[PDB]
Amino acid sequence: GVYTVTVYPGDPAFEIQDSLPQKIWPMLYLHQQRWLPSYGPWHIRFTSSAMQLRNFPRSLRGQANFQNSMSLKLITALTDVISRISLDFYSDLRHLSDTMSALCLIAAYYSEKNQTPLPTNLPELLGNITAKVTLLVRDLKRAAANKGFNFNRNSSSLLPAQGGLYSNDFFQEHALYSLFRTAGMLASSSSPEYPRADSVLAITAAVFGDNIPPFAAYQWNLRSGLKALESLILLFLLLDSNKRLHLEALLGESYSVFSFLMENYLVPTLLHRPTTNMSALFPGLYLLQLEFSSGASTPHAIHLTDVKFRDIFNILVQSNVSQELIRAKQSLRVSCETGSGNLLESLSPGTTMRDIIRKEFMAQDVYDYVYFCVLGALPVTVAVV
């Protein structure tokens, strides 16, 4: 079933089957003798280095790659890889999508701070997202004064040990985990305070059922939800005169900012596609996270990141007759988690993100930032000569 989304106020509405950028990209190849789409600096270097890789799939080597453009197959493949970064590759009854885990965590916190009832279904869980994020961003400043946003990891595997728990110190130095603990959330058998009701479990039991265990007992949903929540906070901070993206020129003359995006893009997407993962909602945010995964934006650090991503992309798009593939998916996901924590640890997350998005993706204002987050690229028309 097709559904409708609007990304920016006053802008046209789009009817999509699953992904907005996947709906847009084919429309940019209907005037190939007049113009081709150009996707920006990071995309041109990525395409250029992919055309030099020995193992690079031949199906993604179209002529457009050499005309300051990308072939439709290559931009589609890249959009797919980025959208699948935070997607669970396995089936597990205990697992929620990262998006739903973040939504349960943020609704529990909002309920505890305002002494208001918990949501009991999907539409209530999707309500007042802007106020929930606003409360979380203002309260988080207190917790982030002495704590960072990166996990204390042991191995590059994403899942916890048999039993459901990570190492005792895994979440210890995380500001968002600490903020939830100060509010009485995620209590355990060894917690020092008199335990309050587990509001996250009451939400999961009501909306999803009995298969979702407590986040403190089966900690994969907590690791997953915390990083999806960091992505929503980074989106809030990024959106808080001339533009690169011109829809009239690309598609035809017929074609707060955060709150509008929530109500007209995020909420309609999750009502029609409830399992949508965070990197599929906001692929551009995951590219920004990948760019800051080393904790630096120097061309040396950017180059090393770009080499690492191109090798990962290469493995993910291979068609050759599986542990190497799993390792690559996990490595890309962990690099984005690291990048996300790094951005939030910077003095001004919004400024750091704005500097990166302007240099690597040529976004010029809030209009371009929102579209970059949803599409993963900001295409421009380039004349064919």
Numbering used by the authors: 105 to 344, 351 to 365, 384 to 449, 453 to 516
Lines from the paper:
Herpesviruses cause severe diseases particularly in immunocompromised patients. Both genome packaging and release from the capsid require a unique portal channel occupying one of the 12 capsid vertices. Recent symmetry-relaxed cryo-EM reconstruction strategies of α- and γ-herpesviral virions provided first snapshots of the unique portal vertex that is essential for DNA encapsidation and release. These studies revealed for the first time a pentameric cap on top of the portal that presumably seals the capsids against DNA leakage after packaging and has been proposed to consist of pUL25 in HSV-1 and its ortholog pORF19 in KSHV. Here, we report the crystal structures of the CTDs of pUL25 orthologs from 3 members of the β- and γ-herpesviruses (HCMV, KSHV, and murid gammaherpesvirus 68 (MuHV-68)), highlighting their structural conservation across the herpesvirus subfamilies. The overall structures of the HSV-1, HCMV, KSHV, and MuHV-68 orthologs are well conserved as reflected by high z scores resulting from structural comparisons using the Dali server and in spite of a low amino acid identity within the “twilight zone” (approximately 20% between the crystallized fragments of HSV-1 pUL25 and MuHV-68 pORF19; illustrated in the structural alignment in S3 Fig).
Similar to HSV-1 pUL25CTD, pUL77CTD and pORF19MCTD crystallized as a monomer. Pentameric portal caps have been demonstrated in α- and γ-herpesviruses; however, neither HSV-1 pUL25CTD nor MuHV-68 pORF19MCTD are pentameric in solution or in the crystal, suggesting that additional triggers or stabilizing forces are required for pentamerization. The crystal structure of the HSV-1 pUL25 CTD displays a remarkable charge distribution with a number of positively charged residues on one face of the molecule (blue in S4A Fig) and a cluster of negatively charged residues on the opposite face. (E) View on the MuHV-68 pORF19 CTD (pORF19MCTD) shown in surface representation with residues conserved across all 4 orthologs colored in yellow. A larger conserved patch consisting of 4 residues distant in primary sequence (colored in orange) is in close proximity to the loop connecting Y365 and S384 (black arrows), which is disordered in the crystal structures of all orthologs, suggesting that the conserved patch is likely buried in the native protein.
